[PDB]
Scaffold this active site. Structure first.
Site, short mmCIF file in Angstrom:
data_model
loop_
_atom_site.label_atom_id
_atom_site.label_comp_id
_atom_site.label_asym_id
_atom_site.label_seq_id
_atom_site.Cartn_x
_atom_site.Cartn_y
_atom_site.Cartn_z
N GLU A 261 0.83 -1.19 0.00
CA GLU A 261 0.00 0.00 0.00
C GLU A 261 0.87 1.25 0.00
O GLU A 261 1.83 1.33 0.79
CB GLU A 261 -0.93 0.03 1.21
CG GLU A 261 -2.27 -0.63 0.97
CD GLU A 261 -3.32 -0.14 1.93
OE1 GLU A 261 -3.35 1.08 2.20
OE2 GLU A 261 -4.13 -0.96 2.40
N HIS A 280 -8.97 2.06 0.34
CA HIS A 280 -8.85 1.96 1.80
C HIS A 280 -9.74 2.99 2.50
O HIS A 280 -9.29 3.77 3.34
CB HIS A 280 -7.39 2.09 2.24
CG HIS A 280 -7.11 1.50 3.58
ND1 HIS A 280 -6.44 0.30 3.74
CD2 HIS A 280 -7.41 1.93 4.83
CE1 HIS A 280 -6.33 0.03 5.03
NE2 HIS A 280 -6.92 1.00 5.72
N1 LIG Z 1 -10.57 -1.26 5.58
C1 LIG Z 1 -10.65 -0.40 6.76
O1 LIG Z 1 -10.78 0.81 6.63
C2 LIG Z 1 -10.58 -1.02 8.16
C3 LIG Z 1 -11.00 -0.32 9.26
C4 LIG Z 1 -10.93 -0.90 10.49
C5 LIG Z 1 -10.43 -2.19 10.64
N2 LIG Z 1 -10.01 -2.88 9.54
C6 LIG Z 1 -9.53 -4.13 9.66
O2 LIG Z 1 -10.64 -5.14 9.61
C7 LIG Z 1 -10.35 -6.18 10.37
C8 LIG Z 1 -11.45 -6.46 11.33
O3 LIG Z 1 -11.50 -5.43 12.27
P1 LIG Z 1 -12.14 -5.73 13.77
O4 LIG Z 1 -12.56 -4.44 14.42
O5 LIG Z 1 -13.31 -6.67 13.62
O6 LIG Z 1 -10.96 -6.46 14.72
P2 LIG Z 1 -11.31 -7.42 16.03
O7 LIG Z 1 -10.11 -7.39 16.97
O8 LIG Z 1 -12.56 -6.92 16.72
O9 LIG Z 1 -11.56 -8.97 15.52
C9 LIG Z 1 -10.57 -9.62 14.83
C10 LIG Z 1 -10.89 -11.11 14.92
O10 LIG Z 1 -9.98 -11.83 14.28
C11 LIG Z 1 -10.00 -13.10 14.91
N3 LIG Z 1 -8.94 -13.94 14.49
C12 LIG Z 1 -7.72 -13.85 15.01
N4 LIG Z 1 -6.96 -14.78 14.42
C13 LIG Z 1 -7.72 -15.44 13.54
C14 LIG Z 1 -7.46 -16.47 12.68
N5 LIG Z 1 -6.20 -17.17 12.48
N6 LIG Z 1 -8.42 -16.94 11.90
C15 LIG Z 1 -9.66 -16.41 11.95
N7 LIG Z 1 -9.92 -15.40 12.80
C16 LIG Z 1 -8.95 -14.92 13.59
C17 LIG Z 1 -9.91 -12.77 16.39
O11 LIG Z 1 -10.45 -13.86 17.23
C18 LIG Z 1 -10.86 -11.54 16.41
O12 LIG Z 1 -12.08 -11.91 16.81
C19 LIG Z 1 -8.97 -5.85 11.21
O13 LIG Z 1 -7.82 -6.57 10.56
C20 LIG Z 1 -8.80 -4.35 11.06
O14 LIG Z 1 -7.35 -3.97 10.97
C21 LIG Z 1 -10.08 -2.31 8.31
#
Ligand SMILES: NC(=O)c1ccc[n+]([C@@H]2O[C@H](COP(=O)([O-])OP(=O)(O)OC[C@H]3O[C@@H](n4cnc5c(N)ncnc54)[C@H](O)[C@@H]3O)[C@@H](O)[C@H]2O)c1
Ligand SMILES: NC(=O)c1ccc[n+]([C@@H]2O[C@H](COP(=O)([O-])OP(=O)(O)OC[C@H]3O[C@@H](n4cnc5c(N)ncnc54)[C@H](O)[C@@H]3O)[C@@H](O)[C@H]2O)c1
Ligand SMILES: NC(=O)c1ccc[n+]([C@@H]2O[C@H](COP(=O)([O-])OP(=O)(O)OC[C@H]3O[C@@H](n4cnc5c(N)ncnc54)[C@H](O)[C@@H]3O)[C@@H](O)[C@H]2O)c1
Ligand SMILES: NC(=O)c1ccc[n+]([C@@H]2O[C@H](COP(=O)([O-])OP(=O)(O)OC[C@H]3O[C@@H](n4cnc5c(N)ncnc54)[C@H](O)[C@@H]3O)[C@@H](O)[C@H]2O)c1
Lengths: 318, 318
Positions: A261, A280
């Site tokens: 990115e 993004h």
């Molecule tokens: N595109 C965007 O603008 C944006 C914005 C916010 C977050 N995100 C990303 O989206 C994703 C989800 O965000 P979130 O708030 O739900 O985070 P979160 O911490 O609430 O949940 C993440 C989940 O991933 C699970 N997990 C961990 N390891 C795993 C594995 N090997 N296999 C399957 N599941 C697993 C964990 O148990 C957890 O429940 C994150 O990676 C975050 O960085 C993207």
């Protein structure tokens, strides 16, 4: 008595802080500018990805609280705050609704072949309707990887409102959480790959999930299935994603996060009509920006009033 | 004996008719082929837009039931069938889920500026993220025009799942129907125009609703509001829509139905980046085709068994 290292995502957090504290703003921080204004402050707001090293914490005398702009805390010297009695708090999950809506937007867009059908009409090829057929989501199977804040909200909406069968893969959540959102948590990832008509990834980026979706994963997926990734770019091994589209291991993909990115100007994925992109922006709404500004600005007033904030990073200080 | 003037949208409707009747299929029907095969049959299915004139009805001796492929009945001489005692049935409402999903697809697409952000990334303008900001649907107001089969399904999903305040304008519906879908029925249309951040059209095309959305309607709407039309093309006076976009009276629009249809190669709407299109596919899914094929095939068997079908166009024959 509070310093803002970088601007907040919304001005409402600055107006709220000015009600109770003397606020100073540094807009574009350099190595030397930060310290000469940080020596006497009692609270600091750090905008990602600006870094706050041990040299900065050592000069801030009355400092009692450090707040990041979002979830990112890697640029902050956590060790220097735990010993000095300083509480550090982040602001995560405040764009949960944004990405949940954004994910839904891309699932529907792929099902209705939206961006493709838009160009056809715009180029006078309205008669493409005789050759192309949209997909009805009601009854199809959605595979959610990562049942966190976003994965649950996406699962909840697709299972009940969109009437989809939602499978979930997340080994780090209690077994009863998937039932609260009318989803079915599975223990084998291969099962989710073969049964899903749509695969949307919302996991945390760990050493386990790094390049979790490679060519080996795309083979198990149905050729008619689609991929949605709003989590992190490194979760998908992008060359294998380019392979899956070109060799038609999957019917398409929707991508909001990239690796690397920003993506290059001539990314090979851009060529395909069955792949759509957003730069993004999944969690970038005005409302989400206000929430981050409010949560960060308000937790400053909580520590300055003795109240325990909800997002302490070093609980050993409380 | 039953004649299929054109194939059904799905073969399941043809298999059902073959269980109880002697079925003959004309795949690419001509006016004279109809004449030579309609003389002895007792039921006929007409695939849109083939016409069934008084000459064909006049030659069908044993004819008791005519079924269209969908809602359209203009190609059938109803008067010539009403006089001869032949019942005519259409097949409406069998794609309710399809249009509901398609409508949702376009509401999300406009909020996340999907096609615009897709083209920007595909053309190397990934940095458009610094200039454009998506919209969060939660908390905004959706104005539903026509709280029928589709309007209700769209209202129910947007009110609960997407967490929107849903207004409805429909003077011919009971006051309690809007509450079943957690919407608020209003009596003055101007209220829905001024209060809505999104306006989605789902009314029947009548002389009352014909060009109901003219320049007077677009002026009352918020400059930040959007328009969605999946109903009929004549409900929107297309020149006034072109003016509203160009003069920025509204923030954008989504169009699945046109007037005139099909849209020309040089439709003035095509120039604008905040207007998206689909080529009249909102209610065209494999599931929707199966349902219509069944309903059309079933009403044929219903009349041949003396049972009153639900979608009779000329009830004065029963
Ligand atoms: N595109 C965007 O603008 C944006 C914005 C916010 C977050 N995100 C990303 O989206 C994703 C989800 O965000 P979130 O708030 O739900 O985070 P979160 O911490 O609430 O949940 C993440 C989940 O991933 C699970 N997990 C961990 N390891 C795993 C594995 N090997 N296999 C399957 N599941 C697993 C964990 O148990 C957890 O429940 C994150 O990676 C975050 O960085 C993207
Ligand atoms: N932008 C999206 O979200 C999205 C998603 C899925 C598919 N698509 C695109 O929609 C089209 C249909 O999807 P599919 O999976 O059923 O593919 P498909 O090849 O299985 O069937 C599509 C039919 O439409 C015709 N067709 C396809 N693309 C055409 C084009 N550019 N110009 C003229 N005729 C064309 C082909 O002759 C084929 O018969 C494909 O071109 C695909 O790339 C876009
Ligand atoms: N679903 C869609 O496709 C959709 C919906 C709404 C708006 N848009 C488009 O998104 C863009 C921004 O939306 P808006 O309603 O906030 O417009 P706006 O007039 O309110 O201002 C948008 C901001 O973004 C910048 N900007 C606008 N268009 C740009 C462009 N083509 N390239 C680079 N920067 C641009 C301007 O400097 C301005 O500050 C507009 O071009 C609009 O046509 C697309
Ligand atoms: N592929 C497609 O895009 C597609 C598919 C199916 C139907 N449609 C069209 O969309 C609409 C489908 O809606 P439906 O299936 O729920 O039919 P419906 O009859 O159940 O609902 C139509 C509503 O229009 C309302 N209405 C009538 N006059 C009105 C007025 N002056 N002001 C406000 N509301 C008024 C009626 O009370 C009725 O509830 C129809 O116009 C149909 O032709 C489009």
């Amino acid at each position: 008595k509070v310093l803002l290292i970088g601007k907040m995502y919304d001005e409402i957090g600055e107006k709220l802080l000015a009600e109770y504290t003397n606020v100073e703003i540094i807009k574009e921080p350099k190595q030397h500018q930060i310290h000469e204004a940080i020596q006497d402050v009692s609270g600091v707001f750090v905008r990602y990805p600006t870094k706050l090293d041990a040299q900065a914490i050592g000069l801030a005398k009355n400092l009692k609280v450090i707040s990041t702009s979002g979830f990112g805390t890697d640029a902050i010297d956590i060790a220097a705050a735990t010993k000095r009695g300083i509480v550090v708090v982040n602001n995560p999950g405040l764009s949960t609704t944004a990405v949940t809506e954004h994910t839904l937007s891309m699932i529907l867009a792929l099902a209705k072949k939206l961006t493709f059908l838009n160009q056809c009409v715009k180029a006078g090829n309205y008669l493409i309707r005789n050759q192309v057929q949209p997909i009805q989501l009601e009854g199809k199977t959605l595979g959610i990887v990562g049942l966190g804040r976003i994965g649950s909200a996406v699962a909840k909406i697709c299972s009940t409102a969109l009437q989809m069968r939602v499978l979930a893969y997340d080994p780090y959540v209690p077994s009863g959480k998937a039932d609260t959102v009318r989803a079915t948590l599975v223990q084998d990832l291969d099962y989710l790959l073969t049964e899903s008509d749509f695969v949307s990834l919302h996991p945390e980026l760990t050493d386990e999930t790094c390049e979790m979706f490679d060519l080996e994963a795309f083979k198990k997926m149905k050729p008619s299935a689609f991929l949605i990734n709003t989590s992190r770019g490194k979760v998908v091994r992008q060359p294998d994603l380019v392979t899956a589209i070109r060799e038609k291991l999957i019917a398409g993909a929707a991508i909001d996060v990239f690796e690397p990115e920003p993506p290059a100007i001539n990314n090979p994925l851009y060529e395909f009509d069955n792949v759509i992109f957003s730069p993004h922006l999944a969690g970038v709404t005005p409302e989400a920006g206000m929430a981050a500004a409010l949560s960060a600005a308000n937790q400053i007033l909580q520590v300055l009033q003795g109240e325990k904030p909800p997002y302490i990073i070093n609980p050993k200080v409380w």
